[PDB]
Amino acid sequence: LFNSEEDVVKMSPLPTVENQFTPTTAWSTSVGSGIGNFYSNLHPALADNVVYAADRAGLVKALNADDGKEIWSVSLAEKDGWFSKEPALLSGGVTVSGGHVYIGSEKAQVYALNTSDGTVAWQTKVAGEALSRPVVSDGLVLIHTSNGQLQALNEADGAVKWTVNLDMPSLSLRGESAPTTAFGAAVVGGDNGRVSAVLMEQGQMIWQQRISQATGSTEIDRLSDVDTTPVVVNGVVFALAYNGNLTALDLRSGQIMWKRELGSVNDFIVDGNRIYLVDQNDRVMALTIDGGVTLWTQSDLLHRLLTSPVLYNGNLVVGDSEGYLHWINVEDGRFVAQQKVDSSGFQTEPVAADGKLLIQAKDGTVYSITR
Amino acid sequence: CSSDSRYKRQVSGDEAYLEAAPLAELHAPAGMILPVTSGDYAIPVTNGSGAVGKALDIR
């Protein structure tokens, strides 16, 4: 019956599982329901020996990051806009600064519940569901939502300092679009194939540069958690387009230093001049910054929907959508370890913090990971 | 054909289509000429070469 119903495209598994430094978790502190296979930018913050974690129901955690002992938890469950204790649909990541845990919502809300007890120290609606985590920076809570706006809320009390559309995708094209702050300027992603750096003070467009195409007008795939969110490690924006097209472009003019437009790059970080990118085939690879020269690539990860490539326990670490964590022999193309701490997968990035590696898995929720 | 039986060149329906029986023209008297030729039914009456009826040569 189900044998011949469609000519489905293929996704390969994880090859060459290693455990050479045998991985584990540092603890389990599983919330239960959580990030989900519901698409979510919600990722936990790991600070103060606290797993500040969250759910999509609204349940935001403070798990004491030695065992993930719950310091506090209230639910943020739709406490503005509509009926209370409906699920908050928490979109943006756990941002923790000051006495607030800032989390965006898919019902166009961005909250701030207090880091010490979970009391909602402020909560403020934004315009549209958040493509970004709430970038709480310089008194401003920079959010890039579905409508391409830089919704900037006040940091300690919540007040919409501006909502300025800079780089709007043609729909709610999904991927990180976060307005980062670099060189006194709000450096803005935006899921329409572009990246920008606008003024930090009010979201005043200093430059907008279309890197490449987006989903729409092309048959490029939306199967991409686009980090057009600028990773600026320089006076040079390193970002993607919505077809994942990696580039270097100048931070205060948008002038393309180079571009490794190599397909829908899933997750990229710029680890010095080892630009740790997750390729279109979900391969981890390092480019340089003076030219995206592949230092190495790795087909030990193939079609995984990887997390970010992070460095932890002496190996380059990445999780995926199938609950496999991985430990790259740091640069060159080799697993050292593979942790199957989950199988629901990790929509949250492996937060190599607190001596641990925090993944909130999707519904196999939070484990901090060690080896 | 394997299914062509009792239908050919002869028309379906009323089979009077082929014999092509013409008709006498409408005549109106003195002073009472209502227009009759206004339709295309006032046809070009040109019986130039070839046959009539079913007997017209085909290709």
Binding site: - | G13, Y17, E25, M32, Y41, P44, G50, A55, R59
Partner: protein, 218 residues
């Protein structure tokens, strides 16, 4: 079939399958000529032979398609006159379809829809080729074919005379009276208008009509 033979070999197989009477095999062969070689020196006649294949095969609108595939693809071998005849010939068969006409039972006022189309193509022959080797029949056909349009139009004039819509009788009868210069049903439409005019107290117009009947007695 649809062979990829030489164009004469697609032709000679097609012509015999016409004379087989298995037109659908001639159709499969004649098209296969004009599928690959419609630039043949018989590919014009092929389309004419296709009309000669289709219309006998009860493939009547495809004959009209091959009437069009002759006029479009193959405007030489000027049997467009034949094609105007054939499209008048086909659409007469296409209009009514019930086989009681073998022993003489009418179907001549149901609706002359393709008989209107058969009129125009017969009219297309007697206009577009009023001299050709086919215009003899279509001229004789058209003076007939208007009556099947008229007897339909008289059956509308029959109803409003039978209903009692005498304002609609004049609408249908003078409709026929403007239309047909030789159908007798129009001459017999004519008194219903007088009957309508007498019913609508337009007796002056009734006797305007009454001497027309005295001349449409002729």
């Amino acid at each position: 079939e649809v062979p990829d033979n030489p164009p004469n070999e697609i032709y000679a197989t097609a012509q015999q399958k016409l004379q087989d009477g298995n037109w659908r095999q001639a159709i499969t062969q004649l098209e296969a000529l004009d599928n690959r070689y419609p630039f043949g020196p018989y590919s014009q006649q092929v389309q004419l032979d296709l009309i000669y294949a289709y219309y006998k095969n009860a493939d009547l609108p495809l004959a009209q398609a091959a009437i069009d595939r002759f006029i479009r693809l193959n405007p030489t071998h000027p049997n467009i006159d034949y094609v105007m005849y054939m499209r008048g010939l086909t659409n007469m068969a296409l209009d009514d379809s019930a086989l009681q006409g073998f022993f003489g039972v009418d179907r001549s006022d149901r609706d002359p829809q393709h008989a209107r189309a058969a009129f125009s193509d017969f009219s297309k022959l007697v206009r577009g080729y009023p001299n050709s080797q086919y215009t003899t029949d279509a001229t004789k056909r058209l003076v007939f074919l208007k009556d099947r349009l008229a007897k339909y139009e008289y059956s509308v004039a029959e109803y409003y005379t039978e209903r009692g819509a005498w304002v609609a009788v004049v609408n249908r009868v003078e409709g026929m009276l403007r239309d047909y210069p030789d159908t007798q049903a129009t001459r017999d439409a004519l008194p219903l208008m007088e009957n309508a005019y007498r019913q609508m107290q337009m007796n002056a117009q009734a006797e305007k009509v009454a001497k027309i009947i005295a001349a449409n007695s002729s």
